């Protein structure tokens, strides 16, 4: 969970070579779904990021 | 007598509207709403609906 009440669990895991990746190669640690944003109305999470 | 007749007839709350949705039965845009949340905290408000072209009620999630 975050510091904003976004509790959740791990669905599955991936290695880097099929994790998505950005131009500098910063491969992310973890990906959460966008739909947890609007209905939870958790703006400060985004601001913190 | 005029003041008494005014004081006889009572509450007339009037249901402020918008024009975005259409009626579930009449299908016209005179729609009025409200907000509050009913169930537990994990979900948002209820988005109550109230038509005024015919008086219909429905709801959106």
């Amino acid at each position: 969970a975050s510091r904003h009440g976004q509790k959740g669990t791990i669905g599955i895991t991936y290695r880097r070579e099929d994790m998505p990746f950005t131009a500098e190669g910063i491969v992310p640690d973890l990906i959460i779904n966008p739909h947890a944003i609007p209905s939870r109305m958790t703006v400060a999470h985004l601001i913190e990021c | 007598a005029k003041q008494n007749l005014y004081n006889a007839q009572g509450a007339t709350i009037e249901r402020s509207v918008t024009d975005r949705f259409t009626c579930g039965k009449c299908k016209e845009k005179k729609v009025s709403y409200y907000q509050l949340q009913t169930r537990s905290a994990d979900e948002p408000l209820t988005t109550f609906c109230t038509c005024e072209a015919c008086g219909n009620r429905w709801k959106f999630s």
Binding site: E24, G25, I26, V27, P28, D29 | -
Partner: protein, 66 residues
Amino acid sequence: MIVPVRCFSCGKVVGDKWESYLNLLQEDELDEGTALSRLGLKRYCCRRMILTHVDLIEKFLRYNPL
């Protein structure tokens, strides 16, 4: 705890750089952002670790076991 070896995101070895990053802030009086830059960590996934790692190991170490 020690610094981690090998940044979780990227994989570059970190841990050689720790005491260096310390003495860049002890006598050289240097600003720390430039300190990491002159330490040579230009991606930021690597950079977060040295910037945020806390060193509890010596606070453990000030006991007297055996």
